[PDB]
């Protein structure tokens with residue numbers, strides 16, 4: 001069903017996608033102990049989840065003042081959108097994980113540390129992703145099937161994950177948050193470029209689909225960063241990820257609110273995980 005567009009436009013999910021779907025994925029509350037102590041997360045498993053199949057995995061971070069339960073709470077209801085999109089064939093089934101940057105020494109900035117050491121091995125040893133094992137080697141070998149995104153301060157988390165975790169993660173969805181490293185947009189872009197240089201990866205091996213609202217305060221700092229990134233050779237600007245690797249979706253009229261941001265995930269998540277995928281698909 002899915003075909004890449006080169007300049008995909010904002011489109012909310014239908015209102016009916018915000019109500020429960022009969023083909024409901026299971027949401028599992030987990031508790032684990034890592035470098036920031038004992039913490040919890042939620043795991044969304046697609047309807048029909050079969051542990052003898054391999055699933056893409058997308059980790060998705062909340063914003064400031066929120067927690068690991070927010071995204072699947074009544075205030076956001078992202079699972080309804082996921083369920084309906086998967087049932088209708090718009091989105092290939094995947095695992096979605098909602099962790100937290102709260103707890104212990106954890107911050108939105110430093111969460112990537114715990115992500116690498118604790119969250120990936122805990123989740124991906126339990127559930128069936130493309131990681132055949134959860135050693136560093138097994139995680140790195142399955143990076144094309146792993147993504148990270150997040151909203152607001154979780155968008156910041158996403159950028160710090162990118163710069164520090166290119167070895168583990170190929171697809172990035174920063175939502176309404178910019179990267180706070182540097183005193184100018186060029187410093188930010190140059191930091192991302194240096195991370196890419198250090199990783200040794202090609203431009204066909206990492207993908208950034210950023211989004212915000214045209215009335216979302218985060219635009220002010222995102223837009224200059226995006227423009228600086230577009231000028232790098234490291235990024236080829238287009239939503240057609242069969243051709244390039246970088247897009248910035250700006251929703252007209254949308255403000256800094258999960259009510260809109262959930263629709264950015266509806267629009268962007270279907271674009272993830274088809275490059276070097278293991279199924280024979282035409283997009």
Ligand SMILES: COC(=O)c1ccc(O)c(OC)c1
Pocket residue numbers: 063064152153155156176177178179217218219221222
């Ligand atoms: C409440 O607002 C935010 O958390 C916020 C707003 C604007 C930003 O550019 C941003 O980047 C991380 C975060």
